[PDB]
């Protein structure tokens, strides 16, 4: 069930098992993910939704992140609690695992990874945070993909016509007033003394 997930950014889908390997929830389930950034780029992992509700103890259900290849050499962090910190993948190879144990009703594991933390800044790339020039197309792509707001963040006469119906009633009154003016000119030029 090890599914590759590599590029510049992406979302590890919340409980992506129904289509890759549709496993029965009765048996314990687990699927690992491998991440590769662009050449010469490290990874930043930021959870967007995470709730392992069925316990605050971890012999059954949890999510873990390992650095480098998918080996036991050095666990970056296994997260077993309400909240989940962001993490820095020193290497360029990602490891994401979730262990479930007849607890498939777990809310989700859902995160987002951003590449190019290592890349030195250049005119082509964008600075958001300290050693975080990440731009290949990432500038304001609709996702909060930098450590705190900075990158995708607040980069970006007809108003008076766009009224709900004040403009409509105003222009109806304007037609009335044009009728009035055109009528007025008639007796501007028509009548005289007596």
């Amino acid at each position: 069930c090890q599914f590759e997930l590599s590029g510049a950014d992406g979302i590890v889908r919340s409980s992506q098992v129904e289509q890759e390997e549709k496993t029965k929830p009765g048996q314990a389930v687990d699927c690992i993910w491998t991440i590769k950034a662009t050449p010469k780029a490290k990874i930043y992992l930021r959870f967007l939704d995470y709730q392992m509700e069925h316990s605050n103890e971890c012999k059954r259900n949890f999510v873990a992140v390992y650095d480098g290849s998918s080996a036991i050499e050095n666990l970056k962090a296994k997260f077993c609690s309400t909240v989940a910190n962001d993490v820095m993948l020193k290497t360029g190879v990602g490891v994401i695992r979730m262990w479930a144990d007849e607890g498939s009703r777990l809310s989700r594991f859902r995160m987002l990874f951003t590449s190019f933390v290592e890349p030195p800044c250049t005119s082509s790339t964008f600075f958001c945070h300290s050693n975080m020039c990440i731009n290949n197309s990432l500038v304001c792509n609709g996702v909060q993909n930098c450590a705190y707001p900075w990158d995708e963040n607040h980069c970006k006469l007809f108003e008076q016509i766009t009224k709900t119906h004040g403009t409509i009633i105003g222009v109806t009154s304007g037609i009335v007033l044009v009728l009035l003016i055109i009528s007025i000119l008639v007796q501007v030029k028509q009548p005289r003394k007596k």
């Binding site: 605050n56 103890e57 077993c80 609690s81 309400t82 909240v83 989940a84």
Partner: protein
């Protein structure tokens, strides 16, 4: 020894601590209701087994079965001990449990959205003047017009000679007719004035006094309008429990058959029997699922929800967009359970009283109920006036125009008929 306390996952009472590394043992839980228990252990001497209940359920029996699913079971079957958690001291439980003395009181109160500064805009005018004066100014204008006319007729100096170059004529000119006096009266109210200025020092006194009265009126109206638009304080439509009854426009509600309905049922004060009659009338949406959806539907529309006082004192501190209109209606007491006949009662009530009258309880309550507080809804009065604030004048103008057309055609036919 060790004691099996029992709590529940209420919102600001006992909630899982927020951390990242795993928590082990009795350090997972966190809240006011369990640090109360910590103080109790410090003053008495305990040993903690904070074990939750089977299924989240305040102990409430089933009449047919005769079982007591909830904390009542673990307080009866001795599989637990004192169950420090919000547990209303009600009559039916008291037979088969023992409750300590309450450590805080309760009651059911209203919940409503505070008003926001959007004036009706129909007539946002005549506000900075009582309508009494608005009527008096018109009737005084009529009175001064009439008296000015009367003074004008009974005067020697109010008669001009038309054709003044010809001194052989009559003196019929008076510059004051049945309508001219009224016209000048109204025209001096608004700071332009007609061209019918008096000539006799007997009526120019009236002119001057009328000028003074209108100057004061206008220069005070402007001041009052500026005062209202500068320091504006909006007030609630309803401000009492009784006001909800005999109103029949707010369409309040309550939780479906929870604890509020239990009170309103059988409540024979009859000040809330009208309340219950209206609730049971529209028993499709006024009685709603739970507290979250209740406050949701309150946020949606005018909906005076009705629930326990402490959860109000909590949720109105986070979402400072609502208000606790009214005071108190009833009183319950959250207590500390204990098995029937256990000696903990008399050894724990004394500790509760010690904490209560030693002053730590109020700080304990405030440390959890506080929240952010009251934000800066105080310096906010920077907005341009719009049609939502000035709309009546255009309506008055249209009415004046149509009345002008009507009276114009009427007078035209009047004169033509009189000639014919």
């Amino acid at each position: 020894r060790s004691l099996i306390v029992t709590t529940i996952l209420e919102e600001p009472y006992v909630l899982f601590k927020k951390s990242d590394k795993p928590l082990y043992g009795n350090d997972r839980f966190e809240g006011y209701c369990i640090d109360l228990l910590r103080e109790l252990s410090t003053i008495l001497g305990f040993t903690y087994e904070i074990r939750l209940v089977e299924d989240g359920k305040y102990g409430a029996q089933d009449d047919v079965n005769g079982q007591w699913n909830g904390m009542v079971r673990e307080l009866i079957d001795h599989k637990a001990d004192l169950a420090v958690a919000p547990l209303a001291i009600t009559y039916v439980r008291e037979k088969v449990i023992d409750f300590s003395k309450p450590f805080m009181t309760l009651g059911i109160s209203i919940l409503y959205r505070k008003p926001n500064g959007t004036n009706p805009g129909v007539f946002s005018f005549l506000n900075p003047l009582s309508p009494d004066i608005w009527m008096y100014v018109l009737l005084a204008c009529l009175g001064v017009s009439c008296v000015l006319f009367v003074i004008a007729r009974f005067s020697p100096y109010e008669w001009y000679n038309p054709h003044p170059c010809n001194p052989d004529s009559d003196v019929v000119e008076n510059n004051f007719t049945l309508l001219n006096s009224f016209w000048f009266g109204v025209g001096a109210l608004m700071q332009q004035g007609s061209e019918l200025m008096p000539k006799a020092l007997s009526t120019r006194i009236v002119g001057g006094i009328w000028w003074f009265f209108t100057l004061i009126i206008i220069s005070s109206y402007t001041a009052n309008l500026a005062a209202f638009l500068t320091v504006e304080r909006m007030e609630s439509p309803i401000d009492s429990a009784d006001d909800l009854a005999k109103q029949t426009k707010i369409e309040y509600g309550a939780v479906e058959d929870g604890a509020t309905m239990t009170f309103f049922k059988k409540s024979k004060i009859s000040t809330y029997d009208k309340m219950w009659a209206f609730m049971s009338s529209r028993r499709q949406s006024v009685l709603v699922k739970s507290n979250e959806e209740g406050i949701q539907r309150v946020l949606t529309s005018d909906y005076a929800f009705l629930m326990e006082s402490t959860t109000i004192e909590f949720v109105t501190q986070r979402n400072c967009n609502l208000t606790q209109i009214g005071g108190l209606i009833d009183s319950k007491g959250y207590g500390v359970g204990t098995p029937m006949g256990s000696p903990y009662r008399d050894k724990i009530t004394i500790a509760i009283l010690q904490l209560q009258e030693e002053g730590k309880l109020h700080m304990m309550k405030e440390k959890w109920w506080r929240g952010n507080g009251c934000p800066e809804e105080e310096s906010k009065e920077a907005s341009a006036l719009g049609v939502q604030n000035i709309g009546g004048i255009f309506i008055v103008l249209a009415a004046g125009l149509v009345l002008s057309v009507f009276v114009a055609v009427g007078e035209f036919l009047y004169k033509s008929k009189k000639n014919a």
